Amino acid sequence: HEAIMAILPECNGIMITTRDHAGMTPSGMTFSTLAGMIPGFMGIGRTYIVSKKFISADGGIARIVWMPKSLKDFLHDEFVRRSVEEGLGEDFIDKIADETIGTTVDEILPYLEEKGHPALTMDPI
Amino acid sequence: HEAIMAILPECNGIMITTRDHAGMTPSGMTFSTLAGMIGTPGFMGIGRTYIVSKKFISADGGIARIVWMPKSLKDFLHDEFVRRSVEEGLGEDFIDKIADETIGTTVDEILPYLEEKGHPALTMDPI
C-alpha cells in the first residue's frame, strides 16, 4: 500500500501517512510500524483521498487532521478543488496539520483548535 | 475500570494509565478517550493491582512490557512493583527504566529514554 490512514480519536479525525515518509506520526508510529500492524487503520491509494467516495459516511476529507507535507504537495490542486466542492474552503488544506506543525497529538491539537478544524466538532469518529 | 492498558507498537510495549490521571498519554489519548473506545484490540481495562499479579499478561512477558505509566501509579504500586521486578529477574530499578510524564507524554519523547536505559521491551519479541 502507498498510504495508510489511522484514526486519531483525540482529534476526532484521521491521519494519513505514506511509504516514502519515514517520520513519526501522531498515531505514535511510522508508516513502517503501521504497515507491519495491518481496525481504525486502512491501507489506501494516494489518489483515493481526492475521490468522491472517500470515507463518505465519516465526512470525507473534512476528517483529515494530519498528512505529510509531501502528500499535500502531491495532492494539492485536486485537494483544493475537492475542498471547495465539499464546502470546506480553498484554505482547508492549511487547516490540516503536517510535520512542520508536529508529529504528535499534543503538538497538533492547539493548531487544529486555532485553525477551527471542522473535525473537532463533527460527530464522533 | 481503574486503569487502561494500551499497546505502543513503536516501543514494542504497553502503556498504562489510570481513571484519575488527566494527562495525555503516549497512545495520543487521555483516559476518558481510551475509556470511550473500550465501551477494542490492543486496549484493556484492568484493576491496578492486576499489574503486580503473577499472571499479568504472562505470554506477553508481564511487567517487562510496560514502558510507560504515570508517576502516581508508580507510587501506588511501588513496593509491590519493585518486589515483582526482582522476582522476574528485572532488578529493583526496573521501575525507573519505565517512562512516565516527567519523561514525556508521547512516543517521540520516551523512546530515547527507553533506549538509553536498555528497557527490555525494546529487545523482546513482537507485541
Side-chain angles (χ1 to χ4, degrees), chain B residues 1 12 20 29 73 81 97 120 124:
Chain B
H1 283 116
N12 204 42
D20 52 289
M29 291 179 269
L73 177 64
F81 192 94
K97 300 196 189 166
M124 288 170 72

Side-chain angles (χ1 to χ4, degrees), chain A residues 46-65:
Chain A
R46 293 182 180 86
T47 57
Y48 174 58
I49 300 174
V50 296
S51 72
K52 322 178 189 194
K53 344 31 166 151
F54 177 75
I55 58 173
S56 41
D58 291 330
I61 45 155
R63 288 288 181 187
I64 307 181
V65 299

Side-chain angles (χ1 to χ4, degrees), chain B:
Chain B
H1 283 116
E2 295 180 10
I4 296 177
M5 32 192 46
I7 290 186
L8 297 179
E10 197 72 41
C11 295
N12 204 42
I14 72 181
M15 52 144 295
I16 306 180
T17 195
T18 57
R19 185 89 231 28
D20 52 289
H21 181 74
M24 186 77 16
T25 74
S27 53
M29 291 179 269
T30 66
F31 179 96
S32 353
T33 302
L34 287 166
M37 283 185 89
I38 67 152
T40 301
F43 307 86
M44 195 184 297
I46 58 166
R48 293 167 295 154
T49 67
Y50 175 58
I51 292 167
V52 293
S53 69
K54 329 102 213 100
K55 267 154 41 216
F56 180 69
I57 57 169
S58 36
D60 290 333
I63 54 157
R65 288 282 182 191
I66 300 172
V67 298
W68 191 102
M69 279 178 303
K71 191 93 224 325
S72 69
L73 177 64
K74 290 182 164 172
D75 294 339
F76 180 72
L77 301 164
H78 191 275
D79 285 356
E80 301 299 84
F81 192 94
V82 166
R83 182 181 80 241
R84 292 286 299 124
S85 299
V86 175
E87 292 166 5
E88 288 300 283
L90 294 169
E92 340 191 20
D93 256 274
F94 171 65
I95 197 171
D96 294 332
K97 300 196 189 166
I98 302 186
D100 54 60
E101 71 280 22
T102 69
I103 305 296
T105 52
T106 72
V107 174
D108 317 31
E109 289 178 310
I110 74 182
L111 244 178
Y113 183 82
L114 304 165
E115 271 155 354
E116 178 43 41
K117 294 297 189 186
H119 194 300
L122 301 175
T123 53
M124 288 170 72
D125 68 25
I127 182 43

